[PDB]
C-alpha cells in the first residue's frame, strides 16, 4: 500500500532504533523514533564529542540540497541535553522523502554515559509542534499535507527479540499488528501524546492523571512521592544513587497496573515490568519503573507498556489509540 513502513530493529531486547536518511546523497542514521519529543537531530561532522567518534555523522557539504541556517539550539531530554545548530536538508523515511528543518548536533557530552553505551546516532521527534524548539511542524503532518500518505497518523508495533521485528508505520493502520479493535483516547493537550487516565498501581490511585505515551522512554515513570509510596510496601529496594529498583522475582504482591478512562481500561501485568537481573540466577528482578517529577500528576508510559499495546497516534483525531499487540 501507500503506507510508509520503517522497521524497528531490536538491540539486546531493551531498546530499538530505526533507519533514517538526511541529505540528497542519502546519508544513513540509526534513530530513536521518539513520540516524546518534536525535533529531529543527527550528530554533525563538526561534532568533537568523543561519543560522536563512534557515530554516523552528517556532512552538509556532501549534499546539494543542504540549506544553511546556523541558528544555535539545545534540546533537553530527561536523560540529558544535546547542542548544535539548525540546518535544512532532504529527510528520508522509508520510501518517502522531504526537505525538513533539523538540528546538526555538535555536542553530546551531557547525554553520556547513555549516548555511547547504546546504539543510535540521532533522534527523530514525533510529538506536536508546540513540543518542538523552533516551531517545526511534525513531519507526518507535513507528509499528509503534501499528500504523500493517506492519513496524518503513525503507529508503533514494538519488536520482541527472537520472535519478530517491530515497525513504525506512517500513513495508515495495518490490522496485522494487533488483536481486537482500537479504542481511542483524546489528548488533553497537543504537545506530547498525553491523555487523561485514572492511574491504579495496586491500591495507590491518582485520578484524572496526565499520561504521556512515549516510545522514547524505556520505563514507566511516576511522580516521586507516588512511586516511593508504591515501592514502600512492596519490598522494592533502590540501588544507592542509581535509577534501578529491585525486588524478588517471586514477589506475588506486585500488582497489575490499571489505567482507566471513562470508557476503557488498559492494564500491565507484572511480567511486563519485571526482569530477572542475572541470566542464570532468577532470584532478584529489576522493576521497570522510574521516579520522574515533571509535575504533580504526570506519568510516562514507555516501552514496557507499548510492548503490550499496539499504539496509534492520530494527529487529525488528536487522539492516541490502543489495542493488544499480536505475538
Amino acid at each position: 500500500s501507500e503506507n510508509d513502513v520503517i522497521e524497528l530493529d531490536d538491540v539486546a531486547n531493551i531498546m530499538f532504533y530505526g533507519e533514517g536518511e538526511v541529505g540528497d546523497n542519502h546519508q544513513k542514521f540509526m534513530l530513536i523514533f521518539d513520540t516524546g519529543s518534536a525535533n529531529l537531530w543527527v550528530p554533525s561532522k563538526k561534532c568533537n564529542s568523543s561519543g560522536c567518534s563512534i557515530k554516523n555523522l552528517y556532512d552538509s557539504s556532501k549534499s546539494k540540497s543542504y540549506e544553511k541556517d546556523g541558528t544555535k539550539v539545545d534540546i533537553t531530554y530527561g536523560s540529558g541535553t544535546v547542542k548544535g545548530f539548525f540546518s535544512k536538508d532532504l529527510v528520508t523515511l522509508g520510501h518517502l522523502s522531504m526537505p525538513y528543518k533539523f538540528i546538526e548536533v555538535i555536542d553530546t557530552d551531557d547525554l553520556e554515559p547513555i549516548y555511547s553505551s547504546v546504539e543510535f546516532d540521532g533522534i527523530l521527534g514525533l510529538g506536536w509542534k508546540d513540543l518542538s524548539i523552533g516551531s517545526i511542524d511534525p513531519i507526518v503532518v507535513e507528509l499528509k499535507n503534501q499528500n504523500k500518505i493517506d492519513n496524518a497518523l503513525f503507529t508503533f508495533y514494538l519488536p520482541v527479540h527472537d520472535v519478530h521485528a517491530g515497525y513504525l508505520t506512517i500513513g495508515g493502520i495495518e490490522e496485522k499488528f494487533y488483536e481486537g479493535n482500537i479504542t481511542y483516547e483524546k489528548l488533553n493537550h497537543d504537545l506530547y501524546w498525553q491523555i487523561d487516565l485514572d492511574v491504579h498501581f495496586g491500591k495507590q490511585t491518582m485520578e484524572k492523571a496526565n499520561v504521556i505515551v512515549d516510545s522514547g522512554t524505556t520505563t514507566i515513570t511516576a511522580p516521586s512521592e507516588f512511586l516511593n509510596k508504591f515501592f514502600a510496601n512492596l519490598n522494592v529496594i533502590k540501588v544507592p544513587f542509581l535509577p534501578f529498583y529491585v525486588t524478588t522475582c517471586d514477589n506475588k504482591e506486585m500488582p497489575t497496573l490499571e489505567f482507566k478512562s471513562a470508557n476503557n481500561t488498559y492494564t500491565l501485568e507484572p511480567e511486563y515490568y519485571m526482569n530477572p537481573i542475572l541470566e542464570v540466577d532468577d532470584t532478584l528482578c529489576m522493576i521497570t519503573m522510574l521516579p520522574v517529577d515533571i509535575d504533580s500528576n504526570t506519568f510516562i508510559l514507555g516501552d514496557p507498556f507499548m510492548r503490550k499495546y499496539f499504539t496509534v497516534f492520530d494527529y487529525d483525531k488528536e487522539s492516541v489509540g490502543f489495542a493488544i499487540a499480536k505475538n
Binding site: 521518539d34 531530554y77 530527561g78 536523560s79 522514547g216 522512554t217
Partner: peptide, 6 residues
Amino acid sequence: XVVXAX
C-alpha cells in the same frame, strides 16, 4: 534508564 524532551 532512558527518558526522551522537557
